[PDB]
Amino acid sequence: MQHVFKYLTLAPVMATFTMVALSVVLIMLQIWFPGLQYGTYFKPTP
Amino acid sequence: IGPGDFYVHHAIALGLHVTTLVLVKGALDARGSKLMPDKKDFGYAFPCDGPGRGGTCDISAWDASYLAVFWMLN
Amino acid sequence: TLEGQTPIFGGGTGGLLTKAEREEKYVITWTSPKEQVFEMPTGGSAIMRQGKNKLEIARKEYGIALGGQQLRAKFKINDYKIYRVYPNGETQMIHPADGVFPEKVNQGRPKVRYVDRNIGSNPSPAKLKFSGVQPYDAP
Amino acid sequence: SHTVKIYDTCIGCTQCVRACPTDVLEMVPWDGCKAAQIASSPRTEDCVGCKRCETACPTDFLSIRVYLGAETTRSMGLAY
Amino acid sequence: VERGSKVRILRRESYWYQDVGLVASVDKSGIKYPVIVRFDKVNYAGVNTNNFADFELLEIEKPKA
Amino acid sequence: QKVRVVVDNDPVPTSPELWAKPGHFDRTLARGPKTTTWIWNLHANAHDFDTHTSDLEDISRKIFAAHFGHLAVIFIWLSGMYFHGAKFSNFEAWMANPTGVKPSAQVVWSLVGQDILNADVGGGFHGIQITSGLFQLWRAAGITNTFQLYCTAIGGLVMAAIMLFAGWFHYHKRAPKLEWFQNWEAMMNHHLAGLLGLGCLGWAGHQIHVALPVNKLLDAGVAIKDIPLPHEFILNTSLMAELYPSFAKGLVPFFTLQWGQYADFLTFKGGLNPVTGGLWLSDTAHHHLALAVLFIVAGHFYRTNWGIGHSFKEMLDDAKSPNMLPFLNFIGPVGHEGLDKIFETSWHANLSIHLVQFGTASLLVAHHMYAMPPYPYLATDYATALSLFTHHVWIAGFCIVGGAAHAAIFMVRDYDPAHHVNNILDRTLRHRDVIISHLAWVCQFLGFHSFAMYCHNDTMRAFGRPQDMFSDTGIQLQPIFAQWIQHIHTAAVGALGTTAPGIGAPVSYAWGGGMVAVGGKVAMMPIALGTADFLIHHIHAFTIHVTVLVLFKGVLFARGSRLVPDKANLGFRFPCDGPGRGGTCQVSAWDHVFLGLFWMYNSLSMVVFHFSWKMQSDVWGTVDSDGIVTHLTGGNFATSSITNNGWLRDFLWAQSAQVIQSYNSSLSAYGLMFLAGHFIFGFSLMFLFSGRGYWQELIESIVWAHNKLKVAPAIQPRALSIVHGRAVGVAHYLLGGIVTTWAFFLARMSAIG
Amino acid sequence: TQAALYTHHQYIAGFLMVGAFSHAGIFWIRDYDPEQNKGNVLDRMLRHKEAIISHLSWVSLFLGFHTLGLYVHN
Amino acid sequence: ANSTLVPCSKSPAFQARMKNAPDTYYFNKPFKAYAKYELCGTDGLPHLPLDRLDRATDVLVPIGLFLYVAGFIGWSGRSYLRATKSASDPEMKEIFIDLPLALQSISKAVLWPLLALQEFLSGDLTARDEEIPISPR
């Protein structure tokens, strides 16, 4: 089992987990707040 | 000029800086580099230094000018 | 004249050309303990005879490849010699030059094209302009 | 013909001589290294310029250098 | 220098020029380059050892104890 | 006794320890990374099993286990198509109205405006119009509802798990010995009679009992809900007799050799079904049934354990002079003797042949499926018809290049000169200059007399001298031999006189015999061949011969040449032998595969371009009530394809209107991918036109900056190897070009198809 | 004529610019010797060539990433 | 003052785009946000100017937010690399991420602007020129 834990720390595995996690964060930001633009961030919805 | 002109000048700036980068790197590495410390003894235009040390294709200063013409045309 | 029996070979397209008859040709001779199949340097397989063999080859690199990588490495044959044959009939033995293989140090061999410095101390080409001397040939 | 030069950083490992496909190099007695031998290039007329010797050389920088020069029939590796 | 010394290479054409290596052994004969230096980083040929002379080395740390 | 099952018990323990040891399979890679080149070498040598170990038995076990893993991948992919066609598709709506609904099985989420790609595909559905032909295949299989597709999706996942367990079992638990893998005769008998023969018989059973009854009702016009489930045609034998009377006689005619009674459902019609435009399912049922008998009989050809049969070794050792035909005795007194040693030890040699024959099979699939559309409503679905031909042409080209690649690997690694003494393999290598020189000459003849005549046509047309052009209206080049074959094949069925009286309709309408229309669109019609077809076919002959020249030179000179006599010692894949001998760049057999990939791409691009333009110009179109056909490009192939200005203008420029104007519509993805393919193609030129010496020196200055900020990595950055740069360049080149054509083909057909 | 003249003189200018750096690289190998240029401004440039090349690489990367990125965003 | 850019809520071309936009999630609220906050050109599309003392936070907030995140990633990687140098096998620490070390590096990188300033003042940010590998001139 410790070998599987060591495998999960591999650079390609950590890169995939980091890229997926960041992709999900950005994807949900598009779903919750679509159309965000420069000069519009952190401003209340009209 | 509007936003369309803004972006193309930055494309031109990219082209100017890369073509300068290829030319300047070739000129300043003409004497030699870590991969070929004694490049000055081989002249301006030679094919390579063989497949050894990882491979040395397009290592001469002439090759940098050759690569820069592609970027100048672009 | 060079003595030996040519290996059993049915003919090939990678043999000698006009250069062999016009400029120069090479011959590799060796002695084998038995009849066995080897690979011709320019493609195909040939059968080397029981006694001493003689093979005509277009380039010197063919003899070094056959003798070095096949005769010595694979068949444990260490007595191969390479000759350069000219159209006029003159034949000179060129490998091994002094009867000892080059990779083994032999007394009496002089130092040829030795530079008494490290390679980083070659002079700049600007110092040798119009003199005809290359930086690696500079004293 | 190509020019092959051997510099004083040679350690006499004989690897360049073994790697040469046309027998340009041989090992000669020397005293500048522990191996008491140095590479020599008596037969540069047979040099093709493959630079296999430079690849085999373990010193840094190279103890053997090939400078491609005038092209002949045997330096171009021509069987015709 | 001596065995175990931490040195900085001064040979200009060396891959480890101005880099740091560790002295492995010193030859007591009169050869041109008696000092053997080992490096953590391999060069472009994958080699991590080379021979240097004393004047091509700069002692930066004495051997331990 | 000779054929037996011998295995080893628990040869490899099942432990995840080596998962945390990257590069363990290779001695050099096991020590760990010192430069970034180590990372690339790990992936490059991952599946090069013969370099992991020299034990052939261990290699063969790796081949067997990995093949189960790839079967699991295919089953997961197949399960995905069935599941997406059962959960996110308009399949049920399409089954009701095949000619008025676009198939769609992919639906996108709505987060960044990408929901615009959910096209109006009809049937009250929004999604991407698929071109894989899944709906037409499923309808021909009798599938009518999404539940049946859902069951097949679950079955695919179960089969994927079974395949995965089989690979683990046959490598970690019971791994066969090398003797097991070397049973040629047993393997052929089981794969001919048991895999191809039994599969054809099993599918014939599915067709006769399920596909024909369901499709006969569908073509009669009854609703989906009124069609009984497939098992009802097996239980209630009265239903099956109404559709085909001969089932009232049961199995009696089969066992009494009175098979003529079965003519009502095992038909031999030829042609196409007028309702759907596909082949008669009764025709395909008798086709597969005849294949099953032929394959099963073929599966008793080889001698395994009972004396009867043929032996591969005896057959090969006999094919030599003077046992050959008198004009075929040139193969020498050894002949095929010694070739048996190749198949005992070389996996690469078998992979070379098998990849070639998948190229042959996939090429036959491409050519024979457009001209003889086997699925209902496939011919009139122009988007699917173009995609299927193009896809299988491309798959064939890669497989053919792979066959030449692993033929070269066999020569470098597995070839043994002692095994081949004056045999045909040895003799071929001994006149390789004969073969390559003649192939080089015929390539120049073909290039001059195919492409330079296009340049002749461009200059004559530009001069205003159409009468001097190579065209139907000028200097004619009629493909008389191909025209003669079309007339012979049309007259064979009755549409060198009636040589096939049993077929009623023409075998393919592409050769003649009439036109078939389904939904106001042409399914198939005679494909006339003129001067333009003569020129384009000899373009194909030229491009194929050159691709052969590149690959076959690499195989024949893999061991060495007059330039580098010891390339075999240098290996299959090495960059060069230095700048000496004038320069020996790209001498290895690997770079001949690398160069051959470009020529395969160039050859096949013109094949799919020839198909796309000719079908749009002379076959596909709409038929009015009066029977007048207006084609998609109005028959401009004959006059415009004879110059490459016409290809530039009337094919590339004109037919790219759909993809170039697809922004702000459901086809905008094809527009984006059209530019994406162009980018990757230009991006690849950086790797192909440059060398690693420049990039390594550039990395030196970049590494200096990271060293200045104490952020230089321990794994030293290295430029890609010379071979790696070539591999990256060719990979991005083919990806960019193929994606560009993919978007070009699909965008146009999704709009006007 | 206006389009022809502008394109003609810009492309010629690009070729001349490549030649300026090409013969600059030739100058380093053939005509430059460190002894007679010891410590001058020409020698100083050669002594921080890595900083020059790396910063030119950064400008090229910054321009390329953001100019192309904004195009494909649009 | 700039006159060729006007507020999007007062641009007839922008109103034409707003009216003709599809009534989906992607256009309903974003168009309202553009109308109140963005300046539009004659083409009716929002334009981003850099010639306004006002709405300076509209320029500084995205710039500062990115620079903090990019510096956070860069400082995490730099501190992690420096910590692995003392290890026996630093290359092995790069293809195998050390979780305790990566978490420690990430935690400190939150305050990277302060740490970078301290390193620069103490001379620990950069290595000396003569101790960096270079090629012969």
Ligand code: CLA
């Ligand atoms: C009739 C017997 C039979 C059948 C059907 C097969 C079938 C197959 N063999 Mg095979 N083989 C056999 C006997 C048989 N073998 C014998 C006797 C030997 C020893 C000489 C071998 C030695 C051998 C080797 C060394 C290799 C194969 C491989 C393969 C596969 C080739 C890939 C392919 O076409 O996918 C076909 C795709 C399918 C989905 C076919 C179905 C796959 C399953 C496993 C078959 C189950 C059928 C079974 C009767 C259950 C039927 C249920 C129902 C219909 C009643 C294929 C599954 C290759 C492979 O990929 O191995 C994994 C391979 O490398 N075989």
Ligand code: CLA
């Ligand atoms: C059944 C098919 C089959 C099989 C079993 C093999 C098996 C093998 N091949 Mg082979 N090959 C095949 C088909 C096949 N090939 C075909 C069709 C071609 C023609 C293109 C080749 C061309 C080829 C070459 C040129 C070489 C091999 C090599 C090898 C050996 C090592 C495998 C390797 O390098 O890992 C593969 C490792 C990789 C990293 C490859 C993955 C990268 C691919 C190219 C990217 C694909 C792009 C993707 C599909 C689309 C875009 C993706 C998206 C993310 C952008 C192995 C024996 C090598 C060898 O040494 O043989 C002894 C070798 O040099 N093959």
Ligand code: CLA
């Ligand atoms: C000559 C072989 C042959 C041919 C012409 C066909 C033809 C057909 N099959 Mg079929 N099939 C075959 C063999 C064949 N099958 C075998 C062996 C199996 C598995 C045991 C199946 C299983 C199968 C299923 C499950 C289905 C079909 C279907 C179909 C129809 C769709 C079109 C198609 O598949 O492409 C036509 C294919 C070709 C033109 C060529 C491919 C055939 C093989 C690969 C040729 C191999 C030759 C090779 C290159 C030479 C080998 C080297 C040599 C030394 C021997 C069509 C009528 C579908 C249908 O519903 O029918 C309406 C369907 O669902 N087939």
Ligand code: CLA
């Ligand atoms: C359009 C570009 C182009 C052209 C014209 C060629 C032309 C050729 N390539 Mg080639 N190639 C190209 C791109 C091109 N390549 C690219 C991009 C690659 C990278 C993959 C390759 C890779 C490649 C390989 C790997 C091979 C070739 C081969 C060939 C030759 C094939 C024989 C032939 O067609 O003779 C006929 C010649 C032509 C069709 C050329 C055009 C002639 C024009 C139309 C007529 C000229 C009239 C008159 C003579 C002009 C004289 C006027 C005077 C003032 C000069 C031929 C010289 C093969 C070869 O040498 O085999 C013999 C070969 O092995 N090429």
Ligand code: CLA
């Ligand atoms: C006034 C301007 C000028 C002058 C005096 C020189 C002079 C020189 N250059 Mg130079 N150069 C220039 C501009 C100039 N260049 C520009 C603008 C560029 C950028 C493109 C270059 C790029 C360049 C490189 C890369 C190299 C030189 C070299 C040389 C020297 C040797 C010339 C040579 O190779 O033989 C004569 C060479 C030729 C005649 C080349 C053949 C023609 C080429 C291939 C163009 C193709 C012809 C085209 C189709 C039609 C053109 C018109 C036709 C009438 C020719 C020589 C001192 C070389 C050198 O010093 O070696 C160390 C060298 O390697 N130059």
Ligand code: CLA
């Ligand atoms: C379309 C063609 C194309 C493109 C895009 C590039 C791009 C680049 N070249 Mg280049 N080059 C090309 C053709 C091209 N080249 C050709 C034909 C030649 C002649 C041989 C050269 C010769 C050349 C030289 C000599 C030099 C360059 C340099 C550069 C870089 C400077 C620009 C930059 O940093 O922008 C930023 C980078 C880009 C725009 C590249 C694209 C980045 C992608 C889009 C990021 C996408 C990430 C995404 C997750 C990937 C998906 C996953 C995927 C891996 C599966 C850049 C990587 C210079 C360099 O490296 O300096 C730093 C340099 O010295 N090139």
Ligand code: CLA
């Ligand atoms: C580990 C973090 C890190 C840091 C702090 C730097 C810092 C620097 N790099 Mg750099 N670089 C890195 C990683 C890093 N690099 C990686 C992984 C690559 C390979 C793609 C490069 C490739 C690269 C090139 C080609 C160039 C620089 C340049 C530069 C300098 C200015 C431009 C810049 O910030 O790069 C901007 C960033 C990039 C160009 C690409 C890096 C993006 C990757 C994906 C970040 C990865 C972070 C890492 C995985 C996080 C792990 C931490 C975790 C273990 C805790 C600066 C000294 C330039 C220079 O020398 O100018 C003076 C230059 O030309 N870098």
Ligand SMILES: CC1=C(C/C=C(\C)CCC[C@H](C)CCC[C@H](C)CCCC(C)C)C(=O)c2ccccc2C1=O
């Ligand atoms: C450009 C180029 C290089 C330079 C390319 C290199 C060193 C490879 C770089 C690979 C990178 C590191 C892969 C990762 C790139 C990804 C786009 C990063 C994703 C980052 C996420 C945060 C998005 C060569 O080394 C080379 C060698 C031989 C012939 C031609 C060439 C050649 O053309």
Ligand code: SF4
């Ligand atoms: S492949 Fe590269 S290293 Fe090899 S000979 Fe060609 S240019 Fe030189």
Ligand code: SF4
């Ligand atoms: S390979 Fe290098 S170190 Fe070894 S003997 Fe030859 S020149 Fe000397």
